[PDB]
């Protein structure tokens, strides 16, 4: 199973957001696992995607991997 | 390619005049980054219309795919860049291209609530019955995300 941000965003239908993570050196779901709505806003993720990405991160926390 | 790396950065940053100068000086229009994005992917995702135009005029591949099956059209359709969608379609973008999760441009316009893009995609032959890997149509996704204007246009299409 792929822990890349690129796979995570693909699954969420948010691949258009990838370059906002890449420019900050963010490549794995474990780097962003503790990100708030505010952290995502600070990446300049378009507002329309923030809730979906945040719920994806929450879903990852909810696995208790 | 050094000019190719420069072109990807200029396309990312939305610096049209810089893109034009790099293309005039022989930059590879189809340069790729580590994820398989071209300057056209970057300009479509970040909403740089004049750069999309310049890149297409200087021989950009309108159907270039990254390492997860994304073409530029679904990236523009997702963020709601209607002008970019129409320019890509006019340059021969595959309206029903599917990514690794089987999502089409219609799926992603329906997902992120872009009504006028859905309408433009329908006019260009978007497939209302196309199923993604979860078995869902654009209509099903428009329900899931509450995009009510899109539910009304796709209902029993």
Numbering used by the authors:
A (entry chain A): 545 to 609
B (entry chain B): 2 to 158
Text taken from the publication that reported this structure:
Here we describe the characterization of Designed Ankyrin Repeat Proteins (DARPins) that were selected as tight binders against all folded domains of p63. This transcription factor is involved in the proliferation and differentiation of epithelial tissues as well as in genetic quality control in female germ cells.
The third and last folded domain of p63 is the Sterile α-Motif (SAM) domain that is present in p63 and p73 but is missing in p53. The initial screens resulted in the identification of p63 SAM domain-specific DARPin A5 that was subject for further characterization. ITC measurements with the isolated p63 SAM domain showed a KD of 16 nM and the formation of a stable complex was confirmed by a shift in elution volume on size exclusion chromatography. Structure determination of a complex of DARPin A5 with the p63 SAM domain revealed that the DARPin bound to helices 1 and 2 mainly by hydrophobic interactions. For the TD and the SAM domain, the high selectivity of the p63-only binding DARPins 8F1 and A5 was confirmed. Fluorescence microscopy detected strong DARPin-created signals in cells expressing TAp63α, TA*p63α, GTAp63α, and ΔNp63α but not in TAp63γ and TAp73α expressing cells, demonstrating the high specificity for p63 SAM domain-containing proteins of DARPin A5. Cells expressing TAp73α, which has a SAM domain, do not show staining either demonstrating the specificity of the DARPin A5 for the p63 SAM domain.
